From a paper:
[name] ([name]) is a UBL covalently conjugated with intracellular proteins through ufmylation, a reaction analogous to ubiquitylation. Ufmylation of [name] depends on the E3 components UFL1 and [name] on the ER, and converts [name] into its inactive form.
To determine which region of [name] is required for the interaction with [name], we prepared a deletion series of [name] (M1–M5) and performed a pull-down assay. This revealed that [name] M4, which covers amino acids 116–214 and is conserved across species, is essential and sufficient for the interaction between [name] and [name]. Analysis of the secondary structure of [name] M4 revealed that the region comprises a coiled-coil motif, a β-strand, and an α-helix, and the β-strand contains FVVEE; overall this structure resembles the [name]-interacting motifs (UFIMs) of UBA5 and STK38. We crystallized [name] in a complex with the [name] of [name] (aa 194–202) by fusing the [name] at the N-terminus of [name], and determined the crystal structure at a resolution of 1.6 Å. In the crystal, [name] [name] bound to an adjacent [name] in a head-to-tail manner; a single [name]–[name] [name] complex is shown in Fig. 4e, left. Further, three hydrophobic residues of UBA5 [name], namely Trp341, Ile343, and Leu345, engage in hydrophobic interactions with [name]. Phe196 and Val198 of [name] [name] are positioned equivalently to Ile343 and Leu345 of UBA5, respectively, and demonstrate hydrophobic interactions with [name], whereas no residue corresponds to UBA5 Trp341. An in vitro pull-down assay showed that a [name] mutant with point mutations at Phe196 and Val198 (UFBP1F196A V198A) hardly bound to either free [name] or ufmylated [name].
Numbering used by the authors: -10 to 79
Amino acid sequence: GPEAFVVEEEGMSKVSFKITLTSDPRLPYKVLSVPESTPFTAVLKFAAEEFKVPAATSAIITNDGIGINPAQTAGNVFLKHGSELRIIPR
């Protein structure tokens, strides 16, 4: 019967973030894409590499300026915060 048809999961396999270095008034950005299951620590590592800044002294925050727990997936960050993120010194 109809109870036997279930939407078990839904998502998007490729997650894209537009990460802006907002301390620089030219607002340099990178659009980075990663698998949905990518640990967010690896997104910070990728972004720091592309911006040529040390991952250890950098952080990624939401467009609204709030911190993100790194121990979650890229897909979950996108679900909560959308695509626009900022890279800042920590």
